[PDB]
Amino acid sequence: PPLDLRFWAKERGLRGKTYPLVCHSLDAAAAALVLWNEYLSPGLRDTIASSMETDEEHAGHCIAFWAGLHDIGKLTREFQQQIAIDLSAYPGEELSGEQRSHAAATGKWLPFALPSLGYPNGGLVTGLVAQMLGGHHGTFHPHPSFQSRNPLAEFGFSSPHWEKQRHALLHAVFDATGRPTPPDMLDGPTASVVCGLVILADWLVSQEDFLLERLTSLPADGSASALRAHFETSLRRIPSLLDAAGLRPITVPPATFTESFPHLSKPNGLQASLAKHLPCLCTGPGLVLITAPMGEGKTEAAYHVADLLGKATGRPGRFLALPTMATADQMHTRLKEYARYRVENTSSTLALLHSMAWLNPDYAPADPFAATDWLMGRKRGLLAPWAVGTIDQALMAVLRAKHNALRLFGLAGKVVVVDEAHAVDPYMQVLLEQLLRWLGTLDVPVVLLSATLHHSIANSLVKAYLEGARGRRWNRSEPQPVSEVSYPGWLHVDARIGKVTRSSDVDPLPIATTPRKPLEVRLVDVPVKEGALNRSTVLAKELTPLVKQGGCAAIICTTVAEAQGVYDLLSQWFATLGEPDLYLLHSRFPNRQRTEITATIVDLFGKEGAQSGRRPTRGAVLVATQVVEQSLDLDVDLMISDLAPVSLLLQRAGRCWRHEHLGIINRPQWAKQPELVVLTPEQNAPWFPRSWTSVYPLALLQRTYTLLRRRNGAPVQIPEDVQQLVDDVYDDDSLAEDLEADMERMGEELAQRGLARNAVIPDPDDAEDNLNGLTEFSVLATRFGAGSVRVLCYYVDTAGNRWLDPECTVEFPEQGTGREGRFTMADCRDLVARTIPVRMGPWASQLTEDNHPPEAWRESFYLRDLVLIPQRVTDEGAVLPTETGGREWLLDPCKGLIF
DNA sequence: AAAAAAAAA
Ligand SMILES: Nc1ncnc2c1ncn2[C@@H]1O[C@H](COP(=O)(O)OP(=O)(O)OP(=O)(O)O)[C@@H](O)[C@H]1O
Ligand SMILES: [Fe+3]
Numbered sequence: 001p002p003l004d005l006r007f008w009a010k011e012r013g014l015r016g017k018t019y020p021l022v023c024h025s026l027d028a029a030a031a032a033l034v035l036w037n038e039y040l041s042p043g044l045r046d047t048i049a050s051s052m053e054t055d056e057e058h059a060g061h062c063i064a065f066w067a068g069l070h071d072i073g074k075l076t077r078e079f080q081q082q083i084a085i086d087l088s089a090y091p092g093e094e095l096s097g098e099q100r101s102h103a104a105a106t107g108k109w110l111p112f113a114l115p116s117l118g119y120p121n122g123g124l125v126t127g128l129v130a131q132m133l134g135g136h137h138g139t140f141h142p143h144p145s146f147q148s149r150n151p152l153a154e155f156g157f158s159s160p161h162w163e164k165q166r167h168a169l170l171h172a173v174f175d176a177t178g179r180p181t182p183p184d185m186l187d188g189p190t191a192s193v194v195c196g197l198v199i200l201a202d203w204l205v206s207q208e209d210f211l212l213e214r215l216t217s218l219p220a221d222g223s224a225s226a227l228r229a230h231f232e233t234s235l236r237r238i239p240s241l242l243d244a245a246g247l248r249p250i251t252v253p254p255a256t257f258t259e260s261f262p263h264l265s266k267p268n269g270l271q272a273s274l275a276k277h278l279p280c281l282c283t284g285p286g287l288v289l290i291t292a293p294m295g296e297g298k299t300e301a302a303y304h305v306a307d308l309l310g311k312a313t314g315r316p317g318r319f320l321a322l323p324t325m326a327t328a329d330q331m332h333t334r335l336k337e338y339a340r341y342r343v344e345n346t347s348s349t350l351a352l353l354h355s356m357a358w359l360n361p362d363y364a365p366a367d368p369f370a371a372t373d374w375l376m377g378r379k380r381g382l383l384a385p386w387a388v389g390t391i392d393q394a395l396m397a398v399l400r401a402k403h404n405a406l407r408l409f410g411l412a413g414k415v416v417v418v419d420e421a422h423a424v425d426p427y428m429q430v431l432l433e434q435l436l437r438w439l440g441t442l443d444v445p446v447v448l449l450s451a452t453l454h455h456s457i458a459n460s461l462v463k464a465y466l467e468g469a470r471g472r473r474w475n476r477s478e479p480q481p482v483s484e485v486s487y488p489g490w491l492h493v494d495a496r497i498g499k500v501t502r503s504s505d506v507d508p509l510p511i512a513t514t515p516r517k518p519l520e521v522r523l524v525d526v527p528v529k530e531g532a533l534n535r536s537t538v539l540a541k542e543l544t545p546l547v548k549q550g551g552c553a554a555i556i557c558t559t560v561a562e563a564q565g566v567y568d569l570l571s572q573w574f575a576t577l578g579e580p581d582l583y584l585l586h587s588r589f590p591n592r593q594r595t596e597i598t599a600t601i602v603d604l605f606g607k608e609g610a611q612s613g614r615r616p617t618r619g620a621v622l623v624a625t626q627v628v629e630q631s632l633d634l635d636v637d638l639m640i641s642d643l644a645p646v647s648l649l650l651q652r653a654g655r656c657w658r659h660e661h662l663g664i665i666n667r668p669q670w671a672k673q674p675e676l677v678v679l680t681p682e683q684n685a686p687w688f689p690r691s692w693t694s695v696y697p698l699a700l701l702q703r704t705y706t707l708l709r710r711r712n713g714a715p716v717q718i719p720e721d722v723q724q725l726v727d728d729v730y731d732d733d734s735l736a737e738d739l740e741a742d743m744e745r746m747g748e749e750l751a752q753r754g755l756a757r758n759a760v761i762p763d764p765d766d767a768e769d770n771l772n773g774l775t776e777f778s779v780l781a782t783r784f785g786a787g788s789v790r791v792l793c794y795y796v797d798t799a800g801n802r803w804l805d806p807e808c809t810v811e812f813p814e815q816g817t818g819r820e821g822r823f824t825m826a827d828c829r830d831l832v833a834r835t836i837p838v839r840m841g842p843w844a845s846q847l848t849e850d851n852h853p854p855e856a857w858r859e860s861f862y863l864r865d866l867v868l869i870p871q872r873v874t875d876e877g878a879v880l881p882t883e884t885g886g887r888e889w890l891l892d893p894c895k896g897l898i899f
Numbered sequence: 900a901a902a903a904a905a906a907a908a
């Protein structure tokens with residue numbers, strides 16, 4: 001029949017005009033086709049068409065055709081009546097009162113009209129294909145159940161009229177994408193990825209510019225050719241939409257190590273053995289597990305590994321996963337330059353992905369690889385050709401929430417690399433395994449970078465990759481894929497056969513790293529007052545040789561109020577000198593402050609301060625919480641930690657003479673050997689302050705302590721005794737002599753790993769025929785725990801007006817400085833910098849209205865959920881600690897927040 | 900009682 005163009009698909013923002021539903025549908029079908037050819041990785045396209053068991057011109061045409069049917073659900077009365085419309089020639093199909101999403105309806109009508117064209121009635125293919133189109137807005141719906149023999153009617157689709165036009169529309173786009181015949185196979189994992197494709201497509205033709213332009217040349221009627229005109233017009237315009245979005249693939253030409261990295265003069269022992277023995281092993285899709293110490297160039301190795309795996313799997317896309325927004329920021333630069341160096345001269349962006357990437361002004365817009373607008377959008381990030389972000393951005397592809405199959409699509413065409421794997425806790429590990437699981441089944445090649453990593457984990461990781469690859473999980477009988485991990489050393493995994501080639505099997509060197517002097521480890525007992533450590537005594541003793549001959553020392557404390565006491569203690573102790581330098585650094589400083597301290601600190605004690613002689617010849621001490629453990633270019637002559645689990649101590653203590661080998665540092669006399677003094681309480685099973693049992697499992701401290709007393713002051717070889725210490729503290733049972741406390745630890749780990757299984761999507765086997773499991777729940781974390789809120793201290797005079805400074809001269813912003821007083825990214829960036837991150841606890845449940853921000857701010861994503869912390873200021877101008885949610889707060893200039 | 904991450908069509 002002649003398909004009437006009165007049926008619309010868009011009304012929003014057209015200035016009273018409407019866009020016909022055929023036209024939106026074709027547009028989508030075009031965009032989906034273009035995508036297929038020009039955007040998707042070659043190796044991806046193959047994985048999909050292979051899983052459909054077909055050729056690609058065909059595969060992309062079926063995909064082209066489907067994607068056009070995504071909004072067919074809009075052809076119901078419930079949807080089209082919303083705006084003014086004359087449906088006098090379409091009686092019947094009266095309102096139900098159900099209010100079905102058009103998407104759902106699409107998923108509902110499709111499985112009983114697709115066989116018209118050749119699809120298996122009840123065929124898993126028809127099953128999957130209509131389910132994934134019905135989920136074209138990021139929620140999947142269950143396969144339609146029905147009791148009669150005429151479900152098209154059971155589901156509402158009952159008018160002969162309306163049903164011809166649904167068919168006309170069905171038929172129109174069938175004609176356009178070339179009447180493609182149904183594939184034989186299609187499964188869940190492929191179909192969710194194909195979902196992402198359709199979604200990206202619905203988005204690209206949904207923009208107002210595109211639409212308003214197409215709005216000037218609407219075909220005059222439903223004729224197969226008026227429509228073939230339009231389908232061809234849109235076919236023509238989509239590529240320029242890719243270019244606006246910075247979507248073109250970043251393609252790097254094959255090269256050696258030395259060619260890729262001209263600048264790097266000498267390859268690393270590790271690097272030489274990778275660049276040599278991997279080209280052969282990279283037969284196709286598979287996994288590389290690299291593991292080695294700090295500063296051993298793994299990033300550079302990684303960029304390379306990726307490229308071999310890149311050619312092997314038709315995958316130029318890049319995602320590099322990092323443990324913090326910080327380490328991501330830095331690495332964004334490292335890869336942007338690597339791209340400028342490597343790309344052939346001849347508009348594809350390179351993305352920064354984390355919550356804060358708007359507040360970076362060197363990234364976000366107001367150059368090739370420059371971030372574009374469109375790509376700045378909310379879930380899009382992972383759709384960029386290359387991209388570097390936090391690991392959380394990727395695990396969000398395997399939690400159960402909306403658009404996780406967009407997130408999957410993005411990850412699919414790329415090589416993916418996660419650094420500092422060792423970082424992840426039990427909760428995140430479980431999330432990762434399942435990502436690795438789903439990437440396994442999807443032919444995406446994977447790189448894992450780490451420092452020393454415990455074996456159980458390494459096993460579990462690659463095991464997950466292989467369970468995904470082959471399509472069946474592991475047996476209790478089946479012989480574990482990993483039994484020992486070598487530090488340093490690498491490891492390759494093949495998809496085709498699941499062969500775990502180690503380093504020791506392809507080459508016997510052993511891998512060369514930096515040579516460095518054995519670390520001293522000194523258990524030092526400490527007296528106890530009121531449950532916590534009084535350290536006054538032992539501090540005067542260990543840092544007396546600093547106050548005399550100079551030096552660089554670092555004191556690490558388990559908690560924040562601790563390292564604040566240990567700063568006061570030290571601070572008074574220099575007021576007596578009176579004429580070393582003294583620094584404090586934890587998580588509780590306003591962002592603005594935290595940065596510059598970090599800056600000063602990685603200048604003095606950093607590698608750039610030895611090379612520039614800026615390293616302080618007078619004594620210098622730093623007092624830190626576990627902030628030290630992440631991303632700090634430091635080097636200290638002496639270090640003194642409180643006990644932690646060994647894994648953390650050995651990384652806390654990687655800083656000591658981290659740049660000794662450069663021989664560009666004179667160490668003080670007293671600084672004989674690289675030393676870690678480790679505080680511990682004096683006893684009366686081993687016991688610890690509650691504040692240590694609170695952050696670390698009592699059992700884990702107790703083991704670590706005993707694992708050290710088992711050496712009696714013997715030194716730790718590096719990098720040779722490190723892996724045996726990380727494996728053993730967990731593995732040995734004989735280190736545990738409190739069993740209640742050591743069973744609590746194992747229970748608490750179950751707790752976390754358990755919660756994570758509840759967050760995650762299904763194992764791909766289980767999603768073989770049913771996508772509905774993917775987005776179904778009843779906000780999900782990428783991290784176990786209560787989390788942090790951000791607080792902003794405002795100051796209040798007795799009037800009391802509100803100020804941003806204790807000097808009460810910068811009025812509190814009731815408004816912004818953009819047009820109409822809206823807040824801006826520049827405005828938020830400024831504002832956010834005075835906010836400080838405070839761990840959720842009972843206090844946040846007792847928040848009065850003067851802790852809840854101005855109404856102007858509720859309209860801003862960054863500012864919306866800020867908690868305001870008042871700090872009263874006297875008439876004589878003094879900051880008093882102030883009541884807020886049942887605890888006294890005081891932002892101190894030199895110490896940070898204090899509650 | 901640590902640190903760490905976290906409106907679309
Ligand atoms: N041949 C080489 N040997 C040692 N270092 C090198 C070499 N070539 C370059 N470097 C530099 O050494 C540093 C090594 O740090 P890299 O970026 O590899 O991180 P890493 O400490 O090795 O591991 P991670 O990625 O976890 O930080 C880099 O700054 C790199 O510029
Ligand atoms: Fe839709």
Ligand SMILES: [Fe+3]
Nearest residue numbers: 024070071202
């Ligand atoms: Fe749509």
